[PDB]
Design an enzyme around this catalytic site. Sequence first.
Site, mmCIF file in Angstrom:
data_model
loop_
_atom_site.group_PDB
_atom_site.id
_atom_site.type_symbol
_atom_site.label_atom_id
_atom_site.label_comp_id
_atom_site.label_asym_id
_atom_site.label_seq_id
_atom_site.Cartn_x
_atom_site.Cartn_y
_atom_site.Cartn_z
ATOM 1 N N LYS A 70 -0.180 -20.051 8.438
ATOM 2 C CA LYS A 70 1.145 -20.199 9.039
ATOM 3 C C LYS A 70 2.158 -20.158 7.900
ATOM 4 O O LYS A 70 2.912 -21.110 7.682
ATOM 5 C CB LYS A 70 1.243 -21.539 9.773
ATOM 6 N N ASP A 118 -1.528 -33.599 17.870
ATOM 7 C CA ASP A 118 -2.405 -33.529 19.035
ATOM 8 C C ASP A 118 -3.862 -33.617 18.626
ATOM 9 O O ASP A 118 -4.591 -32.627 18.654
ATOM 10 C CB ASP A 118 -2.140 -32.225 19.796
ATOM 11 N N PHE A 153 -16.519 -18.450 32.080
ATOM 12 C CA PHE A 153 -17.196 -17.957 30.887
ATOM 13 C C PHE A 153 -17.718 -19.099 30.028
ATOM 14 O O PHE A 153 -18.900 -19.154 29.699
ATOM 15 C CB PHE A 153 -16.253 -17.101 30.043
ATOM 16 N N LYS A 154 -16.834 -20.020 29.667
ATOM 17 C CA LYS A 154 -17.235 -21.130 28.818
ATOM 18 C C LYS A 154 -18.215 -22.090 29.481
ATOM 19 O O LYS A 154 -19.016 -22.735 28.799
ATOM 20 C CB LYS A 154 -15.983 -21.857 28.314
ATOM 21 N N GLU A 176 -0.354 -34.440 23.335
ATOM 22 C CA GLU A 176 0.593 -34.516 22.235
ATOM 23 C C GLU A 176 1.175 -35.908 22.074
ATOM 24 O O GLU A 176 1.631 -36.525 23.037
ATOM 25 C CB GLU A 176 1.704 -33.478 22.436
#
Length: 335
Positions: free
Chosen positions: A36, A108, A304-305, A319
């Site tokens: 980042k 978070d 899928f997961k 958060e």
Amino acid sequence: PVLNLNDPQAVERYEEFMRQSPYGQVTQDLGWAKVKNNWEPVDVYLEDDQGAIIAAMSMLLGDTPTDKKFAYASKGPVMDVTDVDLLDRLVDEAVKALDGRAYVLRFDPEVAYSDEFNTTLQDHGYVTRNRNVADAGMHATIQPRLNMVLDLTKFPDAKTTLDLYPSKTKSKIKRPFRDGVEVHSGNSATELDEFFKTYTTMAERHGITHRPIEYFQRMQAAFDADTMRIFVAEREGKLLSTGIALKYGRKIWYMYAGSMDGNTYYAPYAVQSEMIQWALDTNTDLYDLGGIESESTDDSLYVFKHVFVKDAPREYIGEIDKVLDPEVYAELVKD
Ligand SMILES: [Mg+2]
Ligand SMILES: [Mg+2]
Ligand SMILES: [Mg+2]
């Protein structure tokens, strides 16, 4: 105290703490700031009575439409966040370091949601964002709170991916391999190019935007092959699907994926199988497949997961916001 990024000694000690902590997160590693590169890094830590680091928080500061910055410690801090008195102390260090430049300091952490923890946090003055905020949109949490995590410690004798699953699933995982799908992995430019092709193809197919290749190149430059690995699934000379996994702390995290159009011969399952095998081979506690929108078969991510995680998804606290500028906070953050 605040970490002096120009002090190699200080940085090494900070990194050692992060890499060795059971609470370590790749997004809290100093290497994340390199990824980042358009955000400003501000890192702080607390020491115990022996002077050793006991808690750390790597923050990244971003711009907003106001005169204030947004301070964010992705999946941080690194410590037992339920030890709120200690958290308060670390956050005080962070607030000092921010020096009034940010309207909020948000973190978070991957700690289970609970009314008690939520209440304790609020009692300490933090504003929490979880069940009280929208599931999707610009008001939703940056990171999904529902995550599909495979706890490999539940299978101490597991030797291969198949050993973690019921027969119905073993069949699904074996399918791509029996059909010729082969997976190779590494963290060189070659695998990155393969990933990017499947990644942009996937993006174009879903009419969505994709991060620039430089983002991943910075990731590759920041993390070694024992931390970052790209898995590439192919069948008889044809690229099918890929995935990027990051090994850090107690888990291997499935972070990015891509798949070409048409027949992919269930290559994604092959990619998952190999990422899980990497977790097994490295005696990693957890394999994190990431977030889902909802624990419903109507969610393609879940379906899928769910093939790889039969346990219920983990639901995080969400958060935790340390509000510094109340007016700007109310302007930029709502339920
Ligand atoms: Mg601005
Ligand atoms: Mg093992
Ligand atoms: Mg499972």
